[PDB]
C-alpha cells in the first residue's frame, strides 16, 4: 500500500514507483524502471511505496549522491527501512573512512589477481556445460547455465560444497527479490548461521579458499574478528550468487531475440569485450541506495535526516542524458556511459570476475551454438528488486547448426 506522505515532501514530486513490483514490468524490467525517465518526471521523486522513499532518476544525481558519502550514508542501504536497518554486511554497510580497511581485505579475495588465477577453471566450466547442452537442442538457461556457471566458480573460490547452493541461493533470493517467505533480517540470520561454524573451522585449520583468507586475515594490521569475518563472507556470497547469474540471462535473452547481434559477434568475435560493456549498460540490473545523515537540500529538494533515497545504478546508463537512444543495443557505441557496477567508494569489487565470466560465456557459447531462439510461445518474465532478474529462459536450437570444439 501507500505510506502517508511526510509533511516535508512536496506533493508534486510524488511518483508511486514500486521497486519490487513496477507497473510496467511486463515490458521488460529495465523498461519498467525507465518509466522514471519519461518526459514529465522530475530528477528526484518520492514514492509512497515500500514505506516511502526518494528515488533519483537521472545519472547526474545518482553519481553525485554516490560520491557524497557524508550526506548519503551506506549504513541503511536497502529499502524497505527494516531491511536497510538489519543490513550490516561488510564493507557495504560502512562509509569511508571506516569502510576502507575492510574493503582492502575483500578486494584481495575477489580482485583481479584472483580472477587471473581462476581463468582456466572458468574457461573449462563454461565449455563443459555448453558442450553438454549443445546436442540436446534446448535448455532452461537460468537453471542450466546462468546459475551453475558463475555459482560453481564462486563456491570453488569459497571452498564450499556445491550441494549447499540450493539453500544459499534461496536465502540470497530473499534478500534481493523476496517472495514473502522471509524478511531480509531472517534471510541474513540464516546466512550468518550457515557461516558461523565454517568460519570457526577455517580459523583453526586455514585453507587457501576465500573464506579462510578472510577469516584469518588482517584489517590494516590487526586480526579480523569472527563477527567481522562473518559479515564480510556473507556479503561476498550475496555478491557472487545473484547479479552475474541474472545478468547472464538478460544478455542471453536479448541475443536469442536478435539474430543480427549474434551474427555480429559471430562474424567479429573481437567485438565481444565491447559488446559485454554495452550489454552491461543496457541490461543493468542493480538498485540499492543510501540514508540521509542530516537535513540537506539536494537539487532544490529538502531532504530530511533519516530519509532513504534509492539511487538506481541501473538508471544512469539508460538515461538519455548519458547515452543517446539508450534502449538500443549498439556494440559500436562510442562512449558507453553507465554505473552498472556502482559508483564512488563502493565500486563493485567483483566486476573483474563478472566481466571475465560474461566474456567467456559469449565467446564459448557463440562458438558452439551460434544460432538459437527463445522457445516458441514463451512469455519471458522478469522480476524486480534490489537486483532484478529473469524468472526463466527456455531456449531452443537445431543441433545440426551447432559445432563441437
Ligand X SMILES: CC1(C)[C@@H]2CC[C@@]1(C)C(=O)C2
C-alpha distances (whole Å) from 58 to each of 13, 45, 68, 380 are 15, 11, 16, 28
Q: How far apart are CA 138 and CA 141, in angstroms?
A: 9
Residue 267 pairs with which residues in a beta bridge?
none
| Helical ranges in 41-183 per DSSP H | 59-67, 81-86, 99-110, 112-133, 141, 148-158, 165-176
Q: How far is CA 111 from CA 108, 115, 237, in A?
A: 5, 6, 15
Choose, by CB under 6 A, the member of 30, 50, 57, 92 that binds ligand X: 92
Residue with smaller CB distance to ligand X, 177 or 356: 177
Task: Figure out which of the listed residues 47, 340, 384, 388 binds ligand HEM, where binding follows CB under 6 A.
Answer: 340
**Measured at the alpha carbon of residue 280, what is the angle toward residues 103 and 378, in degrees to the nearest 5?**
125
Stretch that binds ligand HEM, among 25-33, 170-178, 233-241, 293-301 (CB under 6 A): 233-241
Segments of 190-316 assigned E as strands: 218-219, 222-223, 289-292, 296-298, 301-303, 308-310
- x/- string (CB under 6 A) for ligand X, residues 139-178? -------------------------------------x--
The answer to whether residue 77 forms part of the interface with ligand HEM (CB under 6 A) is yes
Q: Would you report the helix, strand and coil content of the chain in percent, each value rounded to 5?
A: 55, 10, 35
Binding of ligand HEM by 215 (CB under 6 A) = no
What minimum distance in Å lies between the beta carbon of 342 and ligand X?
Answer: 8
User: Are the C-beta atoms of 96 and 306 separated by less than 8 Å?
Assistant: no
CB-count burial class (<10 Å; 0-12, 13-18, 19+) for 405: exposed
The rounded distance, in Å, linking the Cα atoms of 209 and 155 is: 9
From residue 68 to residue 87, the character string flagging contacts with K ion as x (rule: CB under 5 A) and all else as - is --------x--------x-x
Q: Which lies closer to K ion via its Cβ, residue 52 or residue 389?
A: 52
- Please tell me whether 233 is known to bind a ligand: no
- Name the one residue in this structure whose C-alpha cell is 555480429: 264
Q: In terms of CB distance, is 153 or 309 closer to K ion?
A: 309
Residue 184 or 250 with smaller CB distance to K ion? 184
Does 46 help bind K ion (rule: CB under 5 A)?
A: no
Residue of closest CB approach to ligand HEM = 350
- Interface mask (CB under 5 A) for K ion, residues 353-392, using x and -? ----------------------------------------
Q: Does residue 91 belong to the site contacting ligand HEM (CB under 6 A)?
A: yes
The binding site for heme comprises: 348
Per CB under 6 A, residues contacting ligand X are 89, 92, 176, 238-239, 243, 286, 288, 386-387
Per CB under 5 A, residues contacting K ion are 5, 9, 76, 85, 87
Amino acid at each position: 500500500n501507500l505510506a502517508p506522505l511526510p509533511p516535508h515532501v512536496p506533493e508534486h514530486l510524488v511518483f508511486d514507483f514500486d521497486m519490487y513490483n513496477p507497473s510496467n514490468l511486463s515490458a521488460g524490467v529495465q523498461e519498467a524502471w525507465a518509466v522514471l525517465q519519461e518526459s514529465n518526471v522530475p530528477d528526484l521523486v518520492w514514492t509512497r511505496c515500500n514505506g516511502g522513499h526518494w528515488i533519483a532518476t537521472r545519472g547526474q544525481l545518482i553519481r553525485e549522491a554516490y560520491e557524497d558519502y557524508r550526506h548519503f550514508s551506506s549504513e541503511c542501504p536497502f529499502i524497505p527501512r527494516e531491511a536497510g536497518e538489519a543490513y550490516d554486511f561488510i564493507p557495504t554497510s560502512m562509509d569511508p573512512p571506516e569502510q576502507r580497511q575492510f574493503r582492502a581485505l575483500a578486494n584481495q579475495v575477489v580482485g583481479m589477481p584472483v580472477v587471473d588465477k581462476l581463468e582456466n577453471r572458468i574457461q573449462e566450466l563454461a565449455c563443459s556445460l555448453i558442450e553438454s547442452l549443445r546436442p540436446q537442442g534446448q535448455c532452461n538457461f537460468t537453471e542450466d547455465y546462468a546459475e551453475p556457471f558463475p555459482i560453481r566458480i564462486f563456491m570453488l573460490l569459497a571452498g564450499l560444497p556445491e550441494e549447499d547452493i540450493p539453500h544459499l541461493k534461496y536465502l540470497t533470493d530473499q534478500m534481493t527479490r523476496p517472495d514473502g517467505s522471509m524478511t531480509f533480517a531472517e534471510a541474513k540470520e540464516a546466512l550468518y548461521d550457515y557461516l558461523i561454524p565454517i568460519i570457526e573451522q577455517r580459523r583453526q585449520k586455514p585453507g587457501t579458499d576465500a573464506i579462510s583468507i578472510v577469516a584469518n586475515g588482517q584489517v590494516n594490521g590487526r586480526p579480523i574478528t569472527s563477527d567481522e569475518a562473518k559479515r564480510m563472507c556473507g556479503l561476498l556470497l550475496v555478491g557472487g550468487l545473484d547479479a552475474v547469474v541474472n545478468f547472464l540471462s538478460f544478455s542471453m535473452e536479448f541475443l536469442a531475440k536478435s539474430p543480427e547481434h549474434r551474427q555480429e559477434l559471430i562474424e567479429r568475435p573481437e567485438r565481444i569485450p565491447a559488446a559485454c560493456e554495452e550489454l552491461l549498460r543496457r541490461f543493468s540490473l542493480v538498485a540499492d541506495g543510501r540514508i540521509l545523515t542530516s537535513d540537506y537540500e539536494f537539487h532544490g529538494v529538502q531532504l530530511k535526516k533519516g530519509d532513504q533515497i534509492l539511487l538506481p545504478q541501473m538508471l544512469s546508463g539508460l538515461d538519455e542524458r548519458e547515452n543517446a537512444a539508450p534502449m538500443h543495443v549498439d556494440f559500436s557505441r562510442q562512449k558507453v556511459s553507465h554505473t552498472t557496477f556502482g559508483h564512488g567508494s563502493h565500486l563493485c569489487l567483483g566486476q573483474h570476475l563478472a566481466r571475465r565470466e560474461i566474456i567467456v560465456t559469449l565467446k564459448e557459447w557463440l562458438t558452439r551454438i551460434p544460432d538459437f531462439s527463445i522457445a516458441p510461445g514463451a512469455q519471458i518474465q522478469h522480476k524486480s528488486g534490489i537486483v532484478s532478474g529473469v524468472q526463466a529462459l527456455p531456449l531452443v536450437w537445431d543441433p545440426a547448426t551447432t559445432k563441437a570444439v
